[model samples]
Target chain A: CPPTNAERLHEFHRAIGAATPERPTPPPPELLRLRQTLLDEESAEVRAEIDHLLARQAAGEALSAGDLAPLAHELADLLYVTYGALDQLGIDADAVFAEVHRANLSKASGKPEGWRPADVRGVIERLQHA
Target chain B: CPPTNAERLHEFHRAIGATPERPTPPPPELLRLRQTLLDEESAEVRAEIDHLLARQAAGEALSAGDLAPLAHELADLLYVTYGALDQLGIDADAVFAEVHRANLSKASGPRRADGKQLKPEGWRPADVRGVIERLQH
Candidate 1:
């Protein structure tokens, strides 16, 4: 049987780690140096959102319909930009998905049937299982 | 062009058969030895039916309605077994459809806009030349 939703959420936080950035905070100077590499101000805004979400996530806030929309849209925009950039660089996103799929399918036999669809949520759930 | 349904079925059969099953077969003795792998046998009687409602697919002797039930059952059982064993090893089946869709989409552009969505038989054919003009850089 699949994990209960609460268990799954707990597992998610554990898997990602307790820190807002996941890893332990580096010295302020290290963060300042890392900030220099960011080309877009949106990157900072996105990172701040991540930090906010991570804190909210750690506080046992419910991840129901109302709480997930903005984060979902933000993540979608990030994916489109990242993948489009990769495509322009001649990296085949389809091929990467194929490779990942083959690896995933080799282990998929006993999984629940209703869970078999190609979408972001499905992928995330599968990754959690992995 | 993607494989036609006939071509896809042929490819399926070809993939199943062009296998090197461990030690190579030793000519005549191989057939007789392999035949003994079965123990249980059925002596029940079965009959075929004729139908006018559906088109027959390749390798199927019966009309659509006649053959569909058996084919669907067999295919479902095979997939179920395949998936069951896969799950024991902690595999995820979702990737199969996802990857297939992604690969097909990469080589193709925007999908053909079907003129209808509700009916089982409704679909629009692609106008490839027109689609080429719509391609993004």
Candidate 2:
């Protein structure tokens, strides 16, 4: 079986020495730059990347081969951008990962219907209510 | 002053607790359609961003109404991106850390100290010329 999300993240953090006693002071310049961009711009840039992927898909092109296709590259970029946003927002990956993992548990199956925005919102509400 | 990104995300996480003891992985079909759906959703996000930027360019004050949709789109973007990575069998946490480490290394190196001000200024061409530039040989 593949490593769990928590396991992978833990390994990543370890590899980056993120847990060292003296954490890097002053966030990275790239992170600072990412935080400065209006969230709207970040969203637009992600969209533009997605457009390239979609165009490639439509042309019957391979979306990715060994992590070098529109799909793979754009997906990685999107994740990077999103994480940058989250990091700037002071949201730790642990919290986001845990919350989403919990939310996924409410699903009857892994069907998309169970994971739509509305359904997710509903699940969240129920969890809060419970 | 506006809340920092960390502050906003902290609040969001506080409202949602940790993952359940028994977490369920997403289904395959959901992952399959994520790429296409992300494509469509991104267009909407781009339109919303354009509208916001236009207002800003006109020196108009941005109200909560303008920002609310943008926040939603961002959240959706994050969701789809995470889903896609999961489907591709790519370790998002690992990639995220790797890129982050690369960025930090660049920052500590001889690059400009004011590099944080830089943004993706132009639309990158849809060519694949540099696809292997960053690939591990």
Candidate 3:
């Protein structure tokens, strides 16, 4: 089998010198740089597809899977880099994501007003102290 | 044992009636609606950042007030992304793991002019569509 996600992310930072066992957590500037990179590079990739589809729709064009393929790939890129950033920041990506998943699962499945966004700070604090 | 991430996401759609009959692809209209939601959510996030940057460009100092919304916007971005995956009938948990492996496989290497990795030798593109196609069947 291949490396686990954590191992792979470790290798990535090792390769890039973002972090290491010497200082597995880098300084704040580096962390913020990488976080901003996600927004500029990976997140931008995903939104580009969204923008493309929106433009096509505005032009009154129909859509197909052919049109949607880039969106899927870009989304994967966004998630991949997101996990990388989370790994850098010492956050438990899986746990936080799972909590988000669980919270959203309860939405719209229950009461009439369960449709708002998930409580991100709620989960963040619970993970931080508990 | 805990439920699989796939199961958690399936429950998300089940609760929301987002798509499927025992899990199938959504109609085009529903998909477009999802696309618009994604667009709007992405815009909200960008707007948050844009506002923050503009403020800092002015004389305003960063405060808890400035950062709190940024945090929420980023988290909501992730939430909305997964919601799009659910509507499309894809198990994003599986897809993300696959993509993570692929990303990790790209050993430290040279990057493009933009500082993006130039796909190293033997590196393969993430099979996100393959995962989606496989599950949709």
Candidate 4:
């Protein structure tokens, strides 16, 4: 498992050749901008690789070992950059993620466990600041 | 400090007490609806990216000011992703951890003609399925 602490995580990143990427006290706007681009780049990569895999499936030849390296690398990149994006925005990702988890847990009922639909109205509003 | 993967799962389990109380799965229709939201958010992300890339391609000078909207879009997309994972009863932090483990394993790996990071010899893919199964029980 990767370090949850930022300091240790970056070092782990470096150790693994990820070369972890930032903050200034940083320019909130500029940092947000930079973060979005990094996220966009990684996300676009994910979509592209997924498209390839989907294409393979469409062609009726989903192989056993269809070289998902592109997908793997990009997905990891996307997750990392997403955290970076949260960090740049000065958001507490851990807390927000916690909140979502808690909220989702409250949305179930019945024997077979039918999920009650989430009302994300206050959820989005809560995310904007918290 | 970010929460550990176990911490994330703990919050989910502790919040509602347990899976029997909260249930580890949802109806297929609900899944589709949530997936629709996920799809829309992803589209919004690409739309913002395309617009920004288009501006850059047109030789227009850009500034951090220009990316403000994209930043908002990015946050929305990211949050929606968490929402989807939540509705799916998946611990996204663990999902991320597994993928990170797999990616880190690719160190000293090869890349293809297009520069995608190819998996190394003896490289096993991310065990995200295993992550889901662990929680499912």
Candidate maximizing TM-score: 3
Native contacts present in each candidate (fraction): 0.00, 0.13, 0.19, 0.07
TM-score of chain B of each: 0.25, 0.52, 0.74, 0.75
On a 0 to 100 scale, what is the lDDT of residue B62 in model 4? 51
Q: Write the per-residue lDDT of candidate 1 for residues B41-125, one digit (tens) a residue.
A: 0000001111111122223332112322322222222222222212112111121222222322233233223211111233333
> Best candidate, DockQ-wise?
3
- lDDT string for model 4 (A33-125, tens) is 455566667766766765665566568753332243344445545656665554544344454444445445555323235554333333334
Candidate 4 ranges with C-alpha deviation above 4 Å? A1-130, B1-23, B112-115
- Please list all clashing residue pairs in model 2, or write none if there are none: A88-B5, A88-B6, A89-B5, A89-B6, A89-B7, A90-B5, A90-B6, A98-B19, A102-B19, A102-B20
lDDT by residue for model 2 (B98-125), tens: 4443443332233235323232334233
lDDT of 1 by residue, A1-130 (tens): 4332112222322332311221111122222222222212323343454455556656866433233223322322222222222222222323333333433343353354554433322332333244
For candidate 2, the docking band is: incorrect
DockQ of each: 0.01, 0.11, 0.25, 0.11
Clashing pairs in 3: none
Q: Provide the lDDT at A3 for model 2.
A: 42
Candidate 4's docking class is incorrect
Q: How far in Å is the alpha carbon of A116 misplaced in model 3? A: 11
In model 3, the fraction of reference contacts reproduced equals 0.19
Task: Report the C-alpha displacement of residue A1, candidate 3, in angstroms.
Answer: 13
By summed lDDT, which 10 consecutive residues of candidate 2 chain A come out lowest?
Answer: A19-28
How far residue A129's Cα lies from its native spot in candidate 4, in Å, is 19
Q: Comparing candidate 2 with candidate 3, which one achieves the higher DockQ? A: 3
Superposed Cα deviation of residue B75, candidate 2 (Å) = 1.5
lDDT agreement of model 1 with the native: 0.26
